[PDB]
């Protein structure tokens, strides 16, 4: 029976002798128990109550140590013995977290039982220095053409995803994860980016949908979902990106690469706000703690492409900031904007205008940019930047009796705008991304009707797949385009364009 098995497990727990350093709660309010006792206690040490609640000890005051309870006060009561767990925060790190949805401590909320954990490593640790750096050049291809050409970044690097509230912010992120499947399938572990999505303050149902979608795309087998759900309290939320980062260190340390998507630091901030205000610390600008900057700077500088000497590894990161009605002047955005190496800025008009992705590429920037990205894709997308630049300027000229020059721009530009639409949750293979943009570069798409761009696209890809799969394999394997390869490619495009 289930009754017998439960009894057996509980029955197998007996005998205490661990308790030593006691504390006694003086008063418990606000999840901030204040203890006189626990004389020798480490800072942010794990403490286990009589109730059993766990805490960290942010305030070590001369006569009281202000434990922060991670859980509910429902079972917590005043005067409680506080056993000293004796360990500053550490979390299991290891390969087992691949395919594991875990709560912050590491307790699987998908209940996938024991975790293959090769270390318990502290959660708050100092970031890779100047000396731990190698030149950045390793492509990060999200399977989104605009990202891959207009704003690409290298591995180990930051780049913000600052954009409009739940406009599939998670959707924009999710697209990348799916593209990482293609590389993941490949044996090479520089091509195995072991993704981590860090769900902060997110409904268990929402994350369940995420999990279900991930399972559907079989992405769970390199995915880790660090979960601090909405229900999960503000201490867990505070430590949630930091804890996640530590997991990342294990992969990185092994010299492997991985991508951690912190989603969203906006909810992390609020949790820190809750902690600070409750710890009565004076709150910073826009009522968000003063040293929230310090938190973010520590977190965001841990993403690093390590030195060849200290083993080439990386830990690419993509923080997500939720713009509160598109506000980018807000204190939490401004700080983050400075730290990040790139930004991607989603735009509401574009979303409405059915441009999905709704990325406004003008307000997207990369400070790593072209340093990483396929050489082939670089060749055929210098033009693209310039063309689009004109299209933006001549965009407002779209509303009469218009100059021929402007009108030519409008034809090329409008077709491009349609082209960078991509049905979300479908990424594209780079060896076929390069052809689509190439066509646009050769302006043969000028001759293709806007509605027929979509049909053309898939058809062109199939035409290339049957007719010129030599070309597709060449583009992929060479990773570079020779004049002869661009010649043949042009021929193929012309031929397809004719039909």
């Amino acid at each position: 029976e289930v009754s017998s098995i439960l009894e057996e497990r509980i029955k197998g727990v007996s005998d205490e002798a661990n308790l030593n350093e006691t504390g006694r709660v003086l008063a418990v309010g606000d999840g901030i128990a204040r203890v006189f006792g626990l004389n020798n206690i480490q800072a942010e040490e794990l403490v286990e109550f009589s109730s059993g609640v766990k805490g960290m000890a942010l305030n070590l005051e001369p006569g009281q140590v202000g434990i922060v309870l991670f859980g509910s006060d429902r079972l917590v009561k005043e005067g409680e013995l506080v056993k000293r767990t004796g360990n500053i925060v550490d979390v299991p790190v290891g390969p087992g977290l691949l395919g594991r949805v875990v709560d912050a401590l590491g307790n699987p909320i998908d209940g996938k039982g024991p975790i293959d954990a090769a270390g318990r490593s502290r959660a708050q640790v100092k970031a890779p220095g100047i000396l731990p750096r190698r030149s950045v050049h390793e492509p990060v291809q999200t399977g989104l053409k605009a990202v891959d050409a207009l704003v690409p970044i290298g591995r180990g690097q930051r780049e913000l995803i600052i954009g409009d509230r739940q406009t599939g912010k998670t959707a924009v992120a999710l697209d990348t994860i799916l593209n990482q499947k293609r590389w993941n399938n490949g044996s090479d572990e520089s091509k195995k980016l072991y993704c981590v999505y860090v769900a902060v303050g997110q409904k268990r149902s929402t994350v369940a949908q995420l999990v279900q979608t991930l399972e559907q795309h079989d992405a769970m087998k390199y995915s880790i979902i660090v979960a601090a759900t909405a229900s999960e309290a503000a201490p867990l939320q505070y430590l949630a990106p930091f804890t996640a980062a530590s997991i990342g260190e294990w992969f990185r340390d092994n010299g492997k690469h991985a991508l951690i998507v912190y989603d969203d630091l906006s909810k992390q901030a609020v949790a820190y706000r809750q902690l600070s205000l409750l710890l009565r610390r004076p709150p910073g600008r826009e009522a968000y703690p003063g040293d929230v900057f310090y938190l973010h700077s520590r977190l965001l500088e841990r993403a690093a492409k390590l030195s060849e000497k200290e083993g080439s590894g990386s830990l690419t990161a993509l923080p997500v900031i939720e713009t509160q009605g598109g506000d980018v002047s807000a204190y939490i955005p401004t700080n983050v904007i400075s730290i990040t190496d790139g930004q991607i800025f989603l735009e509401a008009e574009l979303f409405y205008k059915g441009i999905r992705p709704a990325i406004n590429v003008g307000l997207s920037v990369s400070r790593v940019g072209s340093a990483a990205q396929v050489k082939a894709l670089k060749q055929v997308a210098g033009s693209l930047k310039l063309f689009l630049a004109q299209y933006r300027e001549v965009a407002a000229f779209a509303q009469s009796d218009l100059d021929a020059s402007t009108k030519q721009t409008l034809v090329r530009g409008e077709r491009l705008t349609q082209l960078l639409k991509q049905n979300q949750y479908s990424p594209l293979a780079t060896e076929e991304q390069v052809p689509l943009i190439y066509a646009g570069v050769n302006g043969h798409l000028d001759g293709i009707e806007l509605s027929r761009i979509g049909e053309f696209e898939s058809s062109f890809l199939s035409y290339l797949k049957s007719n010129h799969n030599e070309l597709l394999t060449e583009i992929r394997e060479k990773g570079e385009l020779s004049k002869e390869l661009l010649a043949s490619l042009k021929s193929a495009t012309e031929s397809f364009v004719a039909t």
Partner: protein
């Protein structure tokens, strides 16, 4: 299958009142006394091992 799952929960609640009964039995019996003496000597052994 639904009623079967409900029955597993129901078994736990059946067993919940069994915990209450067993707590009352321990606190009722002079096992309450005699096992406290056992706890006393166990603590003596534990604390002596310190």
């Amino acid at each position: 299958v639904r009623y079967e799952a409900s029955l597993r929960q129901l078994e736990q609640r059946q067993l919940a009142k069994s915990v209450i009964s067993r707590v009352q039995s321990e606190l009722g019996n002079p096992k309450f006394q005699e096992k406290v003496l056992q706890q006393s000597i166990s603590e003596i052994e534990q604390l002596l091992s310190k």
